[PDB]
């Protein structure tokens, strides 16, 4: 898994491309910068003060009337998972009874 060369595409193309999807499309960490250390100086340690850590990306919104669109890393992740599972179910040798 750490070395993508050791998965051969002839034997394991599905596992190789799922590994590539994990290596490239997994969500990135970000920060939000809460608080103030002027009064009640920050108790953050091993991090700088006035910062939080978030395991997913965060851009802030620009409007106050929210609607639906399709541009963020979580919907991208769901799209890639559904894309690999449709590449898996389209193959007939893996489910010959269907």
């Amino acid at each position: 898994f750490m070395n993508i060369q050791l998965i051969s595409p002839i034997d394991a193309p599905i596992l190789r491309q799922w590994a590539e999807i994990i290596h490239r499309y997994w969500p990135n960490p970000s920060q939000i910068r809460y608080g103030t250390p002027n009064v009640f100086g920050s108790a953050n340690l091993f991090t700088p003060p006035e910062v939080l850590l978030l395991p997913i990306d965060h851009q802030p919104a620009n409007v106050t009337t929210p609607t639906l669109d399709f541009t963020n890393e979580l919907t991208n992740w769901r799209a890639r998972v559904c894309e690999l599972m449709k590449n898996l179910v389209d193959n007939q040798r893996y489910q010959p009874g269907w």
């Binding site: 993508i4 990135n28 920060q31 991090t47 910062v51």
Partner: protein
């Protein structure tokens, strides 16, 4: 040298002239926004092994492609892709021209961030209309984006005098990109987000901003001439996967790509062409508390600092980068090894040394410090990469004054050999068969049959069969029987009869053939029959009809040729039947079978005709039987020898059968048989000392091949051990031809040296006392890639030249003349002394040529003396002590150089040799011995002006006769014993040419003998 992979020492360079920047205006944006066929804002990248477009590098107007690839939905093929881009950018062009009139907005600068974000939003259909008022800039580029009020966080957002902006997509991936080993690396610049570049105006405000901001992955600065103003770049935590053995993250890939690009730029600096930027290195600024020592980010920071200072890589980089090359470079940089350079990566500022050639301090106000403390001892020059060769090239050594012990070099070469391998053998002897003939004369001598020699008794032994089978397996021919038959017929149709005057054999002959064999990879007959019938030999007339008999016919009949059989009477009959098949491996039954074949071939001859008989094993009983029975019934005869394979078999040809006469054997036939048997003995003694056909070599053989293979990292002065090993190989080789090859083997730059040993080399190794050492400079300069080949034992496939063969003849004469434990002296060796491989080990030498030598001074067991004082002159030979003087292939050269006659040159030589203390002497003289045939293409004489005119060498020399030479010798000494040594018909000189692993010839050794008869060597003993 090196840090962890070798960098190019002894030089460092950097570009000098930097281009002045150009503001990007609206007319330039329109001209880039439409795509001309001459220039367009995308350049295609292509695969190396297939020449297929697999990636696209992007440029200035389309660089805001930060969204996911699914949001755009490009087609996968490059032509459809670029057509789609041209159409959609033309739509965007019409939109922006509908917004802004060109005639009033021609000469105002446009905003780069808004331009890139506008292209990226229009390609993604993400409400680009609120960017159009921000396209024309005012009061600076950055403050409009700071103090703007349009809310769009997909591209930029302000934090108060610090603008952040998501850069993305320097490269673009196509569908056919498949992470192949020749695909170009993209350095993680094809993802959605690899970094977040934070722009501002002052680095103090940037450093105050990064107090509360994290610095986990580490930030990167640029400090030379940034893209759109002074800024930092913070990479995210995404990975690069298109490099197989190890995975690196984003800022690692950015620093690696810019370090390799600066390593590219340091080589191509020519001090007159300008570059767009003096250094592209990043020099990480805050993350060094998180990435520490021996990590890859730290080591690439070290290499980034070295690239900024202006070092060069020891091995050349390609024009287009490949994943294998990138993998090999990073695998070289993560290894063991200390930082040998004094340059250490700092944190406060990027430092440059005192004598670094970079001039980046003058074109930059903030960032660089000329540190006067540390210095770099290497000189300033560019890189000079020599052009590689596919074939291995010859090397010659040059020696030094230092010296070590012999056993140390023997131990080092035993460490460095790859000697247990199987070399390709080659071929001992190439060409057509040599022909040795003798015929009966009435007036020579009558001799008895018991006086003629026979086979040696040690003939069927294991070593003798080994030598004959080795020579027969290594000697390369076409058809043995065809070459033998052409030789015997061309020497058979030369005979004339004493009764009439014409000849014996004529056209329309009605011949018979005995001993026919079918398989010859052609027709099912011997291959001489149809060309001899069609007259293609052109030294023969064609016969009338050919019938073939023997055990293995295909178009004849099978009989037993011993006792008779129903057939006709044939006017000529040729026999090829041997005494090996029917004879049961003993000389008595073999001789009786010879007698029976002679009886049948005499009774089947149709009298008034001729026959040819082959004899494998000529013994005394065979000679006695043929002398008693055949010779009184034969008019005349001849016995000849075609020489293709080393054996004692001869041919017997008799002419004019069934007439009563009196014929015996002659002294010329006796001389021919002695020469034949001694030739067999010498060549068998040579063939029993060679290794086998398909051997592997272990080092114990007296002749063979040996190699070493030691490695050399980049440009480096090689150590003591490598020099000792190569010099020990040179002392083991002894001035044969030496070929080298430099090539990368399994991730290591290594060179090999391939040459051969000889018994003459072992004699030279026995000559010397201390092992001398070579000058390694001629190998240290080499920066090529010399691809090797598989080793062979006999390298010369075209054969030896007749000058070389003549030289080996004179060398055998010298080595036969010189005894053991005797002082000698030579006239005219050259830069190397070949006579050191000729004289024995205990015999001291003092040679002289007009040219300075290359053999080393000192380190010998016995006395050797080298001096250069024009030996033909006078006043030097008084102190010189010697017993025999040798002048080989140099007296005529000195006579031609002085432009004087050969008699006067020889007289001056004998006048200066009268003062010496020698008593025996042999020198090479230019004298016609036989009548002149003026050899075409190798020695064309001048009869009038008496010159030689060698066409292969372009030289000519005077000569005179042996009468005049003997006259001056007897005028010099009254008691001198003049003699003329004959040539070697018995090939006794071939020892030095075969044991030193050289395929000789056939035609060139014929030409070498016929050249030796026109310039022999005389020997003078002044006493007796």
């Amino acid at each position: 040298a090196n840090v962890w992979g070798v960098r190019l020492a002894d030089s460092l360079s950097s570009p000098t002239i930097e281009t002045r920047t150009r503001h990007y205006t609206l007319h330039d944006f329109y001209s880039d926004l439409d795509a001309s066929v001459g220039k367009e804002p995308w350049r295609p990248l292509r695969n190396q092994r297939t020449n297929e477009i697999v990636a696209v590098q992007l440029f200035r107007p389309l660089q805001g492609l930060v969204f996911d690839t699914q949001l755009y939905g490009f087609p996968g093929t490059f032509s459809q892709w670029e057509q789609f881009m041209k159409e959609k950018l033309r739509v965007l062009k019409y939109e922006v021209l509908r917004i802004y009139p060109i005639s009033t907005y021609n000469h105002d600068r446009v905003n780069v961030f808004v331009a890139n974000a506008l292209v990226g939003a229009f390609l993604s259909n993400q409400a680009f209309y609120d960017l159009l008022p921000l396209l024309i800039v005012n009061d600076t580029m950055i403050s409009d984006l700071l103090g703007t009020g349009a809310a769009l966080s997909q591209f930029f957002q302000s934090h108060g005098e610090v603008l952040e902006v998501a850069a993305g997509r320097k490269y673009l991936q196509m569908n056919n990109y498949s992470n192949d080993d020749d695909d170009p690396p993209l350095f993680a610049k094809d993802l959605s987000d690899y970094a977040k570049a934070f722009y501002s105006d002052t680095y103090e405000v940037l450093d105050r901003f990064f107090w509360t901001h994290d610095s986990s992955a580490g930030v990167l600065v640029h400090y030379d001439k940034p893209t759109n103003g002074n800024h930092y770049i913070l990479g995210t935590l995404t990975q690069m996967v298109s490099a197989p053995p190890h995975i690196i993250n984003a800022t690692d890939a950015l620093l690696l790509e810019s370090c390799l690009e600066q390593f590219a730029a340091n080589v191509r600096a020519r001090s007159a062409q300008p570059v767009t930027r003096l250094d592209q290195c990043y020099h990480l600024r805050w993350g060094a508390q998180y990435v520490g020592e021996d990590s890859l980010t730290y080591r690439l920071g070290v290499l980034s600092l070295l690239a900024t200072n202006g070092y060069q890589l020891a091995r050349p980089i390609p024009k287009q980068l490949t994943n294998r090359w990138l993998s090999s470079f990073v695998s070289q940089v993560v290894s063991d090894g200390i930082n040998e350079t004094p340059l250490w990566p700092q944190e406060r500022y990027v430092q440059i040394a005192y004598d670094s050639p970079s001039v980046v301090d003058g074109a930059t106000q903030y960032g660089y410090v000329r540190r006067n403390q540390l210095r770099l001892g290497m000189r300033i020059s560019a890189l000079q990469s020599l052009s590689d060769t596919p074939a291995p090239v010859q090397w010659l050594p040059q020696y030094t004054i230092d010296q070590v012990a012999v056993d140390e070099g023997d131990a080092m070469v035993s460490q460095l050999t790859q000697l247990p391998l199987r070399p390709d053998y080659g071929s001992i002897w190439i060409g057509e068969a040599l022909s040795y003939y003798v015929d009966y004369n009435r007036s020579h001598r009558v001799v008895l049959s018991s006086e003629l020699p026979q086979l040696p008794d040690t003939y069927f032994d294991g070593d003798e069969q080994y030598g004959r089978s080795l020579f027969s397996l290594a000697r390369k021919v076409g058809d043995r029987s065809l070459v033998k038959d052409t030789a015997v017929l061309k020497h058979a149709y030369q005979a004339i009869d004493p009764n009439t005057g014409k000849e014996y054999l004529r056209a329309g002959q009605s011949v018979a053939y005995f001993g026919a064999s079918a398989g010859h990879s052609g027709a099912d007959q011997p291959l001489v029959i149809e060309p001899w019938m069609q007259g293609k030999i052109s030294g023969v007339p064609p016969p009338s009809s050919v019938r073939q008999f023997g055990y293995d016919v295909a178009k004849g009949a099978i009989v037993d040729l011993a006792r008779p059989f129903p057939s006709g009477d044939y006017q000529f009959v040729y026999s090829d039947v041997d005494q090996v098949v029917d004879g049961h491996d003993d000389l008595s039954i073999s001789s009786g079978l010879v007698e029976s074949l002679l009886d049948s071939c005499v009774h089947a001859t149709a009298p008034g005709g001729s026959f040819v008989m082959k004899i494998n094993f000529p013994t005394r009983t065979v000679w006695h039987y043929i002398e008693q029975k055949i010779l009184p019934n034969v008019t005349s005869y001849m016995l000849i020898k075609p020489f293709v394979t080393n054996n004692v078999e001869v041919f017997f040809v008799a002419f004019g059968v069934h007439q009563q006469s009196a014929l015996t054997w002659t002294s010329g036939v006796y001389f021919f048989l002695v020469d034949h048997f001694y030739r067999y003995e010498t060549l068998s003694a040579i063939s029993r000392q060679l290794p086998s056909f398909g051997y592997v070599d272990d080092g114990s053989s007296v002749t063979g091949i040996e190699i070493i293979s030691i490695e050399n990292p980049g440009f480096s002065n090689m150590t003591q051990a490598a020099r000792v090993g190569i010099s020990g190989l040179c002392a083991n080789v002894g001035n044969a031809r030496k070929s080298i090859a430099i090539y990368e083997s399994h991730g290591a730059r290594v060179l090999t040296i391939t040459s051969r040993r000889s018994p003459a080399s072992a004699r030279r190794k026995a000559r010397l006392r201390y092992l001398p050492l070579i000058d390694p400079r001629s190998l240290e300069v080499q920066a090529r890639t010399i691809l090797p080949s598989n080793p062979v034992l006999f390298d010369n496939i075209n054969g030896a030249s007749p000058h070389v063969c003549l030289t080996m003849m004179y060398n055998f004469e010298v080595s036969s003349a010189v005894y053991d434990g005797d002082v000698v002296l030579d006239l005219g060796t050259g830069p190397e002394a070949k006579i050191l491989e000729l004289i024995p080990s205990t015999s001291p030498v003092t040679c002289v040529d007009i040219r300075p030598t290359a053999q080393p001074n000192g380190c010998w067991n016995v006395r050797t003396t080298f001096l250069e004082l024009d030996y033909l002159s006078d006043g030097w030979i008084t102190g010189v002590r010697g017993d025999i003087v040798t002048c080989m292939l140099s007296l005529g050269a000195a006579a031609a150089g002085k432009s004087m006659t050969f008699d006067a040159a020889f007289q001056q030589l004998v006048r200066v040799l009268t003062r010496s203390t020698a008593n025996v002497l042999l020198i090479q003289v230019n004298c016609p011995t036989d009548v002149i045939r003026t050899i075409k293409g190798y020695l064309e004489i001048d009869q009038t002006n008496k010159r030689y005119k060698f066409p292969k060498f372009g030289r000519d020399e005077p000569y005179s006769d042996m009468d005049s030479l003997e006259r001056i010798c007897r005028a010099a000494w009254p008691n001198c014993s003049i003699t003329w040594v004959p040539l070697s018909y018995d090939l006794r000189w071939t020892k030095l040419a075969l044991l030193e692993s050289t395929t000789l010839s056939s035609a060139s050794v014929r030409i070498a003998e016929l050249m030796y008869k026109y310039m022999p060597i005389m020997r003078i003993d002044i006493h007796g």
